[PDB]
Design a protein around this ligand. Structure first.
Ligand SMILES: Nc1nc2c(ncn2[C@@H]2O[C@H](COP(=O)(O)OP(=O)(O)O)[C@@H](O)[C@H]2O)c(=O)[nH]1
Ligand SMILES: Nc1nc2c(ncn2[C@@H]2O[C@H](COP(=O)(O)OP(=O)(O)O)[C@@H](O)[C@H]2O)c(=O)[nH]1
Lengths: 126, 185, 430, 277, 47, 93, 430
C-alpha cells in the first residue's frame, strides 16, 4: 500500500498483479501483472519500483504502466558455487529448486533451470 | 476414435447427468441457445437445443471434423421429447463398398428421395416423450442395396430436449433394459 | 390494368384537379378531350386512366365527393374541369363542420350510397381492375371521415385489389385547424387497418422545398399541388409506358413492406432546381442520386438522421445506363452503412422507365420506409393526450353520437404502432 | 477530497426512486410542513520542408449522415425500446390507503392474506379490476397484497369472472408497457392463472390480442441464462426467465383460445408456429 | 422545346426567346450525353 | 514542447511473395545505409491526444505484428524525427 | 496536375480578377464559359486551372473569401465575373477593420470551417492535387488574419503538397495603413513556419515600373494587377504546355530553397517596354537576360547590390535554342561573380517552354533568392520596436484578447531570421 503523488492508492497482491485504485470510489484504473508475490512499492520521479518475494525487482512507468525487470537474486541459503574447467568468465550457483549461471564481469545472468518443489544440493561441470 | 475400444451391448455417448455432458460434442449456435434445464414431466435435468433457424443451430460429434466415431453397432436409440415445432437429425455411415452416405430425417420433408450421397425421408413424433429406434442396416439395404459396416458422425438440430443417445446391437424389450437406460414418468 | 381515382374534400379536389392537368398534358389530351399527341406510345395505354367515349372525347375515371359544392364549382371552372363527366360530381347540402364524427356518421351515411353507386358503375365497367387511388387530407372533416368510411366500404367490396392513398398531415409547427389531433388520430386508426400503402406529405416540407430549392418569392398552393402531382404521376409511370426494367404497384408493395402494419412511407422528387442554377450543372445519375437522398429535398418533417432505413425504392424515367444506377445505389449503401437495417442485405430496389415527364431529360421519384416516422405519430399522440385528459372539445363529437371509448382505442392503436417501429429500429442479429 | 461510494445495486439505490414517485413514504402520509486567446507557442513549423511522407491529421471535423464525404463513424441515437419507463399511479394504492378493502396480511414463513369477509359474496365487478390494477406496484406491502389477492380471487371466483374480462384489458396492457421485467413476470404468471380459472375465458380473450400481445414480441428473446453451455441454473425455482414464460404463455393461449386464435397470434408475433395443425 | 420522348427537336421553335447559338449548344450537349445512337421508339411518332 | 503527429513504417512483402519474386531470405543484414529493393514506405496518422509513449507503443505493436520489418520513424510537429531499428536483424525484442 | 487558387481580401480579390482574365484569354474561354480557342494545344491541358462542367461550360478552381461583400459584389458585377461558381463566395457581415486579432480570432474562426469545407470539396475532386496558390496582402486585416489562419489549417490537412503564396508588403517610403508593422510582423512569423515558398511585392516598385519602364501617363490598379497576373501565370506555364526542358513547382522549390527558413524570393518579368521604344530593339535572349537582371525590372525595394544570390531560376517561353540560354546564364554568373554565393557552384536553373504568350515572340519570368531581403525585415522590425516600446495603438489588439508574449515571440523570431541571413551573407569556406 503506497500512495501516489496525485492521491490515488497503489496495491500489491499475492498473485503478482499490481493495480491502481481511485481515491473517490476505489475502482481499477490501470493494472500490470508481474511474477512473484509483491512485497514493497517504491516511488521514483519517473516511475515506480516493485519488489517481489522471489527476489525480483521491476521498474514500471506511470505513463501507461508497462513493466521491465532489472534484478535477479536468490532468496534462500546458497549451497554451492563452481567454475568450469578452463573458463572463468562465468560461474554457476545452486539454491533451492534453481540453478543459475552468472557473468562474472558484469554480474548478469543468462540461464535458469527450475524443478519446482525440490532442493538442489551439489553441482559440478563436466 | 472408438476404433480400439470394447464395443458390445450398449455404447452411449450423451447423458444429461454429469459434470461435462458435452465433453465430446461441438456446438454451432446462432440465433439460438443451448442449456441444461430441469424437466417438469420426469423431474430430472435435460439438455435443450432451441433456435429460430432449424439449419444454423446444431451440435455435432466428434468435435474435430476430421475424426470419425467408428462404431459398428447396428441400432441407434434416441430419447427425444417433441416441442410441437420443427426438428431434424443426421447420421453418416460407411458401407462395405467404401462410400460415405448420409441419412437425414425431418418432420417438414414433403417426399422420400434417394440420391447417391443422401437419402432424405419424412418422420413423425408422437405426443410427450419418445424413444426412437433406428435400424441403420435395414435402411442401408433398402436404400442402396449395400451392407452396413459403421457409423462415423452424429448430428442433432433444434428444437428438441435430449437425455441420452446410445447404440445397441439388437432390439431389447422394456424389462430387459438396465435401470439406468429405462426412463420413468 | 386500370386505376379508378377518388378525390374527397377541398384538399382532395384541388390536388385532383392539378393531377388531371398533369396527366392530360403527359398523354397529349386537349381540354376539349381531343387527342392531339405526337406518339403512338401515348395512345396505347390511355385505357389505364381514361374511358372511351363515342366521338373524339375521352373521360377520366374519377369520382369527386364533397359536402358543400363550392370547391366543385371552382374545379368545374378550372382549366381542365370541363373534361370531367357531369354525373361524377356528388355533393350534399350541408357542410362537415370540420368535425370527423359528423363527416363519418351523419352526412356520410346519408350520401355514401350515391358514391358507392358511382364507384361500382365505374369499377364494373373495367375489363380488369387494378387498385384504387384516393387523395385526401387527414386534418379536415369530410375528407377524413367520409374518405375513411368509403375506403372501408371499398375494402369490403374489393378486398383482393390494391388500396393506395396520398394523405396530408398536420405540420409540427403551425396548425391550420384547432381539432387536428382528434381527426388525425381517428384517421390513422382507420388507415393502418384498411390501407395497403399510405404516403404522407407536410405542407411545411413543400414550403421549405419551394423557398430553399426553387427560390420562389411568393409560392402558392398551385406549386405545392404540382409537386404532389409530380410524385403521384411518377409512381404509376411504369404501368403505362415501356422500359428496361418494368415495375408495378404490387411489386413496390411486396419489396417495401416487411410487415403489414409498417406501410407508411416518405416521398421525394429529385430534379428540382432554380432557373439561375440550371446553367451551372447538367443532369446526371450521380447528381440525381445525391439530391435524391439529401434530407433537404424530402417531403416529411422527420429527418432520416434520427432513424434507419428498412427499405427504399427509386423509379427512374429516361434512357440511361443500368451500371451507373447499380453502382451508385451500392456506393450510397456502403458509405452510410450504419443508417441501413443490417438484417436485410440490400435495402434499395431500382426500376428504369424509358419515357420521362415532359420537358425533363431525366427524373427519379424516391419512396422510403423509415423509422423516423415514429416521431410524427408520437407528437400527434402527445397533443391528443393533452386535449383528451381535459375533455377540451369532446362534447361536439359526443353530441354527434360517438362513445368516448373510440378515442382511447385509437390512441392505444397509434401508441402500439410507435412501439412496433421502435422495436424494429433497435433489433439486432445476435 | 470527499469520497463517493458506488452505492449501486445496494440497499440504498437512487435508481428505484426515479420510478414510481408515489413510493418512499411511511405507513402514514407526509409529515406536516416544518419537520482569453492566450499565446501557446509555435505549435508547427513544417513550412519549407514539405514531403510525401506527410499526410493530413485534421481531416475536417465530424460527418453529416448524407453528405458527399460520408457519415464516417457516426451512428444514430438509440430509440430505447428496452429503457425503463415511469409507473403510472394506481387505484389500488388509493383504496388500500383509504381502508375500503376486505383484506389483511397474516405474516409467517409462507405469507398469506387473511380475509375479513367470505370471497364468494364479493362484487367482482368492483374488486377484480382494482386488484389487477395493483400488479404494477414495486413497493411492499402493495406487491404482495395485490398479486396474492389476484391469485386468490381468480382461484375461488367461479362463473362470475367471465363478464369481468372487458374491464381487465387496460390494467393488463398498462402493466406490460412499463418495461420492468419483474412486473412483466408477475403479469405473465397471473395471466397463466387467469386463462385456466373457469370456462369460456380463452375464447373471450381472442379479440383482445391486439392490445396484449404487442409487448410479448419485444421480450420473447430476453434470457437470464448467462451460464455457458451445459451449466445448470439453480434459480429455476424463482421463475425469473422472461422468454420461457412468454413462450409458454403463448402456447397456453393458443390451446385455450379456440377455433382461430392461431391467425391472430401469428398476426401479432411473426415468428410463432401453430401448435395444433 | 421537346417532344414526348424527350428530344430537343431540329428546327427553331416559334416565338422562341433563345438565340441560334444557344440552340446549337443545347443540341450538341444533348447529343453528347445520349446513351444510344438513335431513339428506339422513332416508329411511334406521328405528325 | 512539440508533440508527435505521425509515425512512418518500412516493411518487406510477405515471405512467400518474396520467395516467389526470387530474392534470398537471408543476407539481409549489411553495414551499408541502403535498403532492400522491395521495401515500401507507409505512414499513419496519430490522434490528437497522442504522446511519445503511445506512439512508441504503436511502433512496438507494428514490430511484433508481422515478419519483414526493420525500420521505424516517429515524426513530430516541429519537423524533426527519430528512427528505431533492430539491433539484431530477423530477431524481435 | 491541377492547382487550386485562394483569393482573400480586397487586394487578393482584385488581383485574382485580373489573373482569371489573363488565364481565360490564354486558353480561349469566353466570359460565358464557352471554349472559343483556336488550337487543340489549348484544350489538352485546360484541366490545370479549370474544372470541367457538364454542358458547354468551364468552372475555375478558386475560393473567394472576404469579411464584407463589397469587393466581391464589384468583381461579380465585372465583365468576367459570371465564370465564378456562386457557391464559392464565402462572406461574413462585418469588416476586419485592418486589425489582425479581429481577422484571426473573432470572424476568422466563425468562417474558417465553411472555407475549409469548400477547399476540401474542391481538393478531393481532383484526380491528382498539386500545391495551393494564395494571393493576399500582409498589411491588411482579413487578408493577413484569415489568410494565415487558412494557410495553417491547410498545412495541417495537406502537409505533403506545396504551399505557395503571393503577398503584398508595406512600402519603405509611404504607408497605406497606420498599423502595418504589427500585422506584417505577425503575418511573417506565421508564414516563415507555415509556407514553402513566398513571393513579396511592393506597390512602390510597381509604380517605378510604370513610370520608368512603361512611361504610362495615368496608370491604374488594373495595370499593376496585370503585371502581377503576368508573372503568376508565367511561373506555371511549363506545367501546362510542352517544352524542351520541363519544370515543376516542386522542382523549383527543391532548386531554390537551400534551408527551410530561407524561402523568400524576388520576382521579375522581362519584355516590359514603352510604346515609343519598341521600334528601337528587336527581341533576343541577351536582351531578355539584361532586362531580367536589371533592378529597374525587379518588384521589390531592396537592391541586389547590397546582398548575394544563393539561387535563381529563369523560365523561358518561346522557340529558342538551349545554347544561348545556357551560355547567357553562365556569362551573367561569371561577370558578376562577387554577387553570387561562392560555396554553390551554379546558382541559376533554366527552363524552356515552346509556347509564348500571344503577341510576344518570347518571354521570361525571373525568380530570385537574395539576402538583401533582410533589410526590409530589419526596417519592419525597427518600426515594430518603436511602436511597441510606447504600446502604440496596443489596446485594440489587447482588447480582442492577444497575449503580449505573442508580440515578443514574433519579433524575436523575425530578428533571428535577419541575423541568419546576415550570417550566411558573410559566411566563408575557411
Ligand atoms: N398541399 C395542400 N394542402 C391543402 C390544400 N388545400 C387545403 N390544404 C390543407 O388541408 C387542410 C384543410 O383541410 P380541408 O381540405 O379544408 O378539409 P375539408 O374541409 O374536409 O375538405 C389544411 O391543413 C390545409 O392547409 C391544397 O390544395 N394543397
Ligand atoms: N497592388 C495592389 N495593392 C492593393 C490592391 N488593393 C489594395 N492594395 C494594397 O493592400 C493594402 C490594403 O490591404 P487590404 O487588401 O485592404 O486588406 P484587407 O482590409 O484585409 O482586405 C494597401 O497597401 C493597398 O495599397 C490592388 O488591387 N493591387
Amino acid at each position: 500500500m503506497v500512495l501516489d503523488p496525485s492521491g490515488d492508492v497503489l496495491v500489491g497482491s499475492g498473485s503478482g498483479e499490481v493495480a491502481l485504485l481511485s481515491k473517490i470510489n476505489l475502482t481499477i484504473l490501470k493494472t500490470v501483472t508481474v511474477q512473484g508475490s509483491v512485497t514493497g512499492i517504491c516511488t521514483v520521479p519517473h516511475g515506480f519500483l516493485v519488489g517481489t518475494m522471489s527476489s525480483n525487482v521491476y521498474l514500471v512507468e506511470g505513463g501507461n504502466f508497462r513493466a521491465e525487470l532489472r534484478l535477479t537474486c536468490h532468496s534462500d541459503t546458497i549451497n554451492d558455487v563452481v567454475f568450469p574447467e578452463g573458463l572463468s568468465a562465468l560461474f554457476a550457483t545452486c539454491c533451492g529448486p534453481d540453478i543459475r549461471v552468472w557473468n562474472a564481469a558484469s554480474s548478469a545472468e543468462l540461464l535458469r533451470i527450475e524443478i519446482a518443489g525440490l532442493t538442489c544440493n551439489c553441482i559440478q561441470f563436466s | 476414435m472408438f476404433h480400439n475400444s470394447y464395443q458390445s451391448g450398449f455404447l452411449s455417448i450423451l447423458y444429461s447427468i454429469g459434470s461435462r455432458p458435452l465433453q465430446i460434442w461441438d456446438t454451432k449456435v446462432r440465433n439460438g441457445h443451448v442449456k441444461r434445464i430441469t424437466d417438469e414431466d420426469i423431474q430430472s435435468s435435460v439438455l435443450e437445443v432451441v433456435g429460430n433457424n432449424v439449419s444454423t443451430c446444431y451440435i455435432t460429434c466428434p468435435v474435430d471434423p476430421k475424426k470419425t466415431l467408428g462404431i459398428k453397432l447396428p441400432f441407434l436409440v434416441m430419447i427425444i421429447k417433441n416441442l410441437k415445432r420443427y426438428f431434424s437429425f443426421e447420421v453418416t455411415i460407411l458401407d462395405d463398398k467404401g462410400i460415405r452416405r448420409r441419412f437425414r430425417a425431418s418432420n417438414y420433408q414433403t417426399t422420400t428421395r434417394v440420391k447417391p450421397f443422401t437419402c432424405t425421408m419424412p418422420m413423425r413424433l408422437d405426443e410427450g416423450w419418445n424413444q426412437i429406434q433406428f435400424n441403420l442396416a435395414d435402411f442401408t439395404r433398402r436404400a442402396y442395396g449395400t451392407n452396413y459396416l459403421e457409423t462415423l458422425r452424429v448430428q442433432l438440430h433444434a428444437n428438441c430436449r435430449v437425455r441420452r443417445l446410445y447404440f445397441s446391437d439388437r432390439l431389447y424389450s422394456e424389462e430387459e433394459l438396465p435401470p439406468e437406460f429405462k426412463l420413468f414418468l | 390494368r386500370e386505376i379508378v381515382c377518388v378525390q374527397a374534400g377541398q384538399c382532395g379536389n384541388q390536388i385532383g384537379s392539378k393531377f388531371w392537368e398533369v396527366i392530360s398534358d403527359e398523354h397529349g389530351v386537349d381540354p376539349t378531350g381531343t387527342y392531339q399527341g405526337d406518339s403512338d406510345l401515348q395512345l396505347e395505354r390511355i385505357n389505364v386512366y381514361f374511358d372511351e367515349a363515342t366521338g373524339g372525347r375521352y373521360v377520366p375515371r374519377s369520382v369527386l365527393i364533397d359536402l358543400e359544392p363550392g370547391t366543385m364549382d371552382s374545379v368545374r371552372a378550372g382549366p381542365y374541369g370541363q373534361i370531367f363527366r357531369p354525373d361524377n360530381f356528388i355533393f350534399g347540402q350541408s357542410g362537415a363542420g370540420n368535425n370527423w364524427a359528423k363527416g363519418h356518421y351523419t352526412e356520410g351515411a346519408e350520401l355514401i350510397d350515391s358514391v358507392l353507386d358511382v364507384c361500382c358503375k365505374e369499377a364494373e365497367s373495367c375489363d380488369c381492375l387494378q387498385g384504387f387511388q384516393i387523395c385526401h387530407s387527414l386534418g379536415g372533416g369530410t375528407g377524413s371521415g367520409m374518405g375513411t368510411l368509403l375506403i372501408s366500404k371499398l375494402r369490403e367490396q374489393y378486398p383482393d385489389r390494391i388500396m393506395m392513398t396520398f394523405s396530408i398531415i398536420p405540420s409540427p409547427k403551425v396548425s391550420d385547424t384547432v381539432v387536428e389531433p382528434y381527426n388525425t388520430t381517428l384517421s390513422v386508426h382507420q388507415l393502418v387497418e384498411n390501407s395497403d400503402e399510405s404516403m404522407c406529405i407536410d405542407n411545411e416540407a413543400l414550403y421549405d422545398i419551394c423557398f430553399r430549392t426553387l427560390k420562389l418569392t411568393t409560392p402558392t398552393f398551385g406549386d405545392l399541388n404540382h409537386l404532389v402531382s409530380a410524385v403521384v404521376s411518377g409512381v404509376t409511370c411504369c404501368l403505362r409506358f415501356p422500359g428496361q426494367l418494368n415495375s408495378d404497384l404490387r411489386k413496390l408493395a411486396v419489396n417495401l413492406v416487411p410487415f403489414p402494419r409498417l406501410h407508411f412511407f416518405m416521398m421525394g422528387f429529385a430534379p428540382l432546381t432554380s432557373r439561375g442554377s440550371q446553367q451551372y450543372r447538367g443532369l446526371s445519375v450521380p447528381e440525381l442520386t445525391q439530391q435524391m437522398f439529401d434530407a433537404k429535398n424530402m417531403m416529411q418533417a422527420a429527418d432520416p438522421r434520427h432513424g434507419r432505413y428498412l427499405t427504399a425504392s427509386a423509379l427512374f424515367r429516361g434512357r440511361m445506363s443500368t451500371k451507373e444506377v447499380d453502382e451508385q445505389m451500392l456506393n450510397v449503401q456502403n458509405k452510410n452503412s450504419s443508417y441501413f437495417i443490417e438484417w436485410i442485405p440490400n435495402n434499395i430496389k431500382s426500376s428504369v422507365c424509358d419515357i420521362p415527364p415532359k420537358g425533363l431529360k431525366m427524373a427519379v421519384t424516391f419512396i422510403g420506409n423509415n423509422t423516423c416516422i415514429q416521431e410524427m405519430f408520437r407528437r400527434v399522440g402527445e397533443q391528443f393526450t393533452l386535449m383528451f385528459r381535459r375533455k377540451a372539445f369532446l362534447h361536439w363529437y359526443t353530441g354527434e353520437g360517438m362513445d368516448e371509448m373510440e378515442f382511447t382505442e385509437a390512441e392505444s392503436n397509434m401508441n402500439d404502432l410507435v412501439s412496433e417501429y421502435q422495436q424494429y429500429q433497435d433489433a439486432t442479429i445476435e | 477530497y470527499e469520497i463517493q461510494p458506488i452505492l449501486k445495486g445496494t440497499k440504498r439505490d437512487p435508481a428505484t426512486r426515479k420510478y414510481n414517485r408515489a413510493a418512499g413514504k411511511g405507513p402514514f402520509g407526509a409529515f406536516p410542513p416544518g419537520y482569453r486567446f492566450a499565446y501557446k507557442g509555435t505549435v508547427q513549423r513544417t513550412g519549407g520542408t514539405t514531403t510525401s511522407l506527410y499526410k493530413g491529421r485534421q481531416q475536417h471535423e465530424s460527418a453529416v449522415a448524407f453528405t458527399t464525404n460520408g457519415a464516417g463513424d457516426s451512428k444514430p441515437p438509440k430509440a430505447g425500446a428496452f429503457k425503463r419507463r415511469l409507473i403510472p399511479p394506481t387505484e389500488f394504492r388509493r383504496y388500500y390507503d383509504r381502508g375500503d378493502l376486505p383484506l389483511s396480511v397474516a405474516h409467517g414463513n409462507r405469507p398469506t392474506i387473511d380475509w375479513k369477509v367470505d370471497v364468494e359474496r364479493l362484487d367482482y365487478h368492483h374488486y377484480l379490476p382494482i386488484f389487477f390494477d395493483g400488479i404494477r406496484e414495486t413497493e411492499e406491502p402493495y406487491m404482495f397484497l395485490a398479486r396474492q389477492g389476484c391469485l386468490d380471487l381468480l382461484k375461488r371466483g367461479g362463473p362470475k369472472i367471465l363478464p369481468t374480462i372487458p374491464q381487465l384489458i387496460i390494467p393488463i396492457k398498462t402493466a406490460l408497457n412499463t418495461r420492468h421485467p419483474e412486473i412483466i413476470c408477475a403479469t405473465l404468471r397471473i395471466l397463466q392463472q387467469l386463462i385456466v380459472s373457469g370456462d369460456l375465458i380463452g375464447e373471450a380473450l381472442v379479440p383482445y390480442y391486439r392490445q396484449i400481445l404487442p409487448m410479448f414480441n419485444l421480450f420473447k428473446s430476453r434470457h437470464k441464462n448467462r451460464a455457458r453451455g451445459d451449466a445448470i441454473d439453480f434459480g429455476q425455482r424463482k421463475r425469473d426467465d422472461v422468454g420461457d414464460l412468454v413462450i409458454e404463455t403463448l402456447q397456453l393461449l393458443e390451446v385455450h383460445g379456440g377455433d382461430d386464435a392461431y391467425i391472430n397470434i401469428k398476426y401479432m408475433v411473426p415468428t410463432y408456429e401453430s401448435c395444433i395443425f | 422545346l421537346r417532344n414526348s420522348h424527350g428530344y430537343v427537336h431540329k428546327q427553331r421553335a416559334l416565338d422562341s426567346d433563345i438565340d441560334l447559338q444557344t440552340w446549337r449548344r443545347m443540341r450538341i450537349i444533348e447529343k453528347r450525353i445520349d446513351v444510344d445512337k438513335a431513339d428506339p421508339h422513332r416508329h411511334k411518332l406521328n405528325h | 514542447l512539440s508533440q508527435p503527429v505521425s509515425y512512418s513504417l518500412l516493411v518487406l512483402p510477405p515471405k512467400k511473395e518474396l520467395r516467389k519474386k526470387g530474392y534470398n531470405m537471408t543476407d539481409i543484414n549489411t553495414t551499408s545505409t541502403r535498403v532492400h529493393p522491395l521495401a515500401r514506405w507507409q505512414t499513419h496518422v496519430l490522434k490528437h491526444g497522442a504522446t511519445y509513449r503511445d506512439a512508441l507503443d504503436a511502433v512496438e505493436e507494428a514490430n511484433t505484428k508481422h515478419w519483414g520489418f526493420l525500420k521505424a520513424r516517429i515524426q513530430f510537429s516541429c519537423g524533426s524525427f527519430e528512427s528505431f531499428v533492430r539491433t539484431n536483424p530477423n530477431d524481435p525484442s
